[PDB]
Amino acid sequence: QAPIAAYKPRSNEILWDGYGVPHIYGVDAPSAFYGYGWAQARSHGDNILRLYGEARGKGAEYWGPDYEQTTVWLLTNGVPERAQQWYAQQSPDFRANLDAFAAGINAYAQQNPDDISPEVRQVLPVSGADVVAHAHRLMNFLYVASPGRTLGEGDPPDLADQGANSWAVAPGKTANGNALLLQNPHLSWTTDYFTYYEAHLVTPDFEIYGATQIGLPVIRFAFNQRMGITNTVNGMVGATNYRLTLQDGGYLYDGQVRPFERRQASYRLRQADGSTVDKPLEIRSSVHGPVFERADGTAVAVRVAGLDRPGMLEQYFDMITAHSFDDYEAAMARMQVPTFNIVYADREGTINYSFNGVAPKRAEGDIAFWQGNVPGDSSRYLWTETHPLDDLPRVTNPPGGFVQNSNDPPWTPTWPVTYCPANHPSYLAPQTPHSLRAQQSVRLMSENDDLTLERFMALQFSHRAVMADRTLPDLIPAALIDPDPEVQAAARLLAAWDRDFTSDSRAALLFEEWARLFAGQNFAGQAAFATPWSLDKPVSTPYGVRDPKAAVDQLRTAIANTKRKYGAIDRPFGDASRMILNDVNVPGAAGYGNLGSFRVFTWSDPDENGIRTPVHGETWVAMIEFSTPVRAYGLMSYGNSRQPGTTHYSDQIERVSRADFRELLLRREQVEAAVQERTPFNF
Template identity: 40%
Template structure:
């Protein structure tokens, strides 16, 4: 009897050990040929550990630079050039706020962060040679780093990006998104287009990953240095974000008086404090510099002159669970679950565009909109003068107050950074039903082009949707060339008539081989597309996608065209230079013909310039992550991460997708087990010390 019991215990012990080994072996990273990690795990802890490891593998030095800057210690690590950024971090109080968030965050967030950081630190320990000497000072990383980096990106680059831009310049950001319902889809399946436009550098870069937790497939991207998926899809649904014209930060101009500032005509004392920033000198020694900090009832002072200060107020400082909301969104299986995640209201910015397997499409003007005393958008879309306590908002609108549309009768939804009113044409949302400060009223040429492509197609195939996403046709050219030609015909300008020949033969696209794009682009920049006064018929909400139209001053248009012709002939000796010969991709040693343009002229395929020489202009940002997804019986998805999924200088994936960008191509998202298996380059398996390559 004892012998039988003994062998039974041995068998149980053996099976338990075998089961544990199977579970440990199940946590692995399958790296595909594009450097995308396909992570399979049985626990949340191991999943995020693996994602942290994978991010460091592809972006170790970038992450350390980003985290060091977000700590507000860039000057201490790398010298004086980082001082202004450190001062901003400390002025906005991110160090103290991160401590508050660390105490109040949901336990699930803490698990995600702790595991993610452990994975990154484990990689740094296992591969010290992957890290540049000057970046090692940032190690080890902590959970607080995730909080400080997330608030740095969200608050300084998005929520208060425009407001801080009045003090110091930040990049223009944008995006496109489509949701096509079954009634407009040739297959009867809902489809989604994900397409943020961000700069191709630093904290704006995306990281692509495929996560499989206990058999649940999740795919998409997030900004480098952040865990999870912020724009993504699973087998049942997906969403994208676009920057919305939401005003949820305000800058106040306050008059100084007797060491304080005026509030309602009375003196109010500043809250004062100071921080000491260490600055590394060229010889390696440190110098301490104390920075005084002032705070008003409006928020921290971000700029000061002799007589006035600028104070900044932002939403979202009390929302520490933003990444948990994204995690719940990607784990949702239906619209009700997804909407429950949205109702957490932790994500303070960005429209949401959604589609799912059951055929639902949905648009939400997402974000935290302050409840304000003055109704007019124009009142708040400025530096607000004076110190009125009535202008200091304290509450935000609840989810139910926000503009949203589910399953519109026209069968599609679009957003290209336009206000919510034009997410459908004809419009389904009436701005009069919302506070005037909710969003402005406008529709520029890019969203007009966006809507036109859907309006003109009653039965949209997946391949057509891909073509629309990659379209470089200029809405502004279609709108204005007939008027420009009329003006040319009425003039006696030989230079203008010479230009007309080129423009008539031009295909009105910004493709690499388009001849006439450079001529039109150069003229349009001088014409000033954004100025409503340049048009005979101004933009109106009654005709949102067909105005403005006509040239208000034909004589001026001809003069600008003559000047353009003279400049191009002097520089290039010709007017029909191929766009890709002039507009180039210059990234990590690659030099390729570009296509697309900035969105001001109505190009859906956005690639804005970020530098130039005498002979060329170079792409600096725009299309970054692209996903086109169809939710049928099986998910069908094409994707592209324009600049590749790595920034490590020795990685083959640093810029390896730019050739596809240059050729206007997407690649398959390898989502099923069979697809991943057939495209796996190598596999890493989790051990007690991180991951080891499977032989």
């Protein structure tokens, strides 16, 4: 019936468990945020202070050369100053929480100066504005508008490997009648701002368990006794790069030569000897927005949407603390979160999918057109309005009894679908072939019924080489008629494979190498299938091999590659695939999502000895059943801390190698039973 009574904290304290997971208890909100800020300082202080410093545009001043590009990017886009505005524009209530958070961080550093790396001490003290600045940078100028896209360069490995999985199951599809939720982000294992942190906040008025990126005062992947939500990247096109026609010191626009908006700014660049050199920086703007110059000499102006949405953090906070789905939807309706697909589920039995973000209203052009260089010489392409929530693809309690997204276009959020590409403007999302992992996603959910939490988790462990199922039947035969015995031996090895990425697979590695050539290095190539992908058979296409003879030459080559990389065509998958953190070295399993593996581990290239580890992949994984009280399990691949000397960095990877999940503790008693360290505090 009613949720179990939440705990009313009678004093401020952090109860840490054996895994470095803080259970922050505050007599009020500001107190809790302060504890949260303290805990994050404890667990990831160095990187948070580094990121906050960058967000001030002081990256070059504080750490020199390797941080300069980001400084120029953030200054030119006026990020540090807008953070001050956004900060000021906060609601009095929330601004107090942000100030607490910053005080928590400051406090921790004050009482533990030794735990703070020397090179980041100059960043202290930090303020509520700094928090806001970072989140603004992350959301708007990393996720939505990255310097790579605008500068016409690219980005260090983050192509399609910035993915995730997400499921929400309606009570009707379960055995117990409680909704189920899956949080499963697949971001880099090394990039600092992408590091996830696990925490638990409790005040007399709210409770929030979950993971979030270091430096964020709100929990993005949260849940509690009442509800929970998860996120996945949808690539919402919130920015436009306009090509400019330079002319007579200005730029051509609507037939006339408009002069630029010029501002002479400056920043400090640290020198090897510790001194700083003052460096000039002219910031030019066009009616579109800031202007950058590419290497090829192209003058590009970037127009980022939602620069007037200062309530990002508060939206997330109100969303996750919502007392009902209605409240939740009202919160999301503020349009303060610029991107992401978001999934919801609660103890009431409601599940929801939302292609969220702030999208510019446009009158022409498909997504591909808007993702490229839009002509910047006419007011014809200068958008100003953005779409309301109800203009975007969304699903609630569908007939299928579930929702899901694995970075695939929003065209198959459930089965049967409830809408189609035609119902929305063609610039919102792409209409491209869904990845094999995404197809596996729809299958695992729609094909199963009467689910239990345990079965639900087991399905999450799927590591099927769907790619094989679509190709081997045609490849194998064609390869067997090849005169080269080694090729024939390869075909037999492959045909004996159960087509699952297990540690012991002797054919997996070889298959991958073949697939690299058959479907491109990222495994997304379609040019080689006999039957092209189709939205009408979204989970069974593409299929077959268009040119078996060619594909065999590819296998011929792939065989050489496998031996060169691993030393044999039949090396055990988990012998070359390892998960190495600190001094822990465990065998790997599961693999590339584009090859159909639901559970993901994007293996890196192998080293001298054919050993390789995950570059991106599983990180924070949790499955929640909204029973009363709720039940949840989770694991954090890379622990809950990265502070030099911490015992909580490599202390979970072993359980990951065995899919041995931790029961997430929400109830006071459970917490008291697992406490290993108490940190009392006053705000």
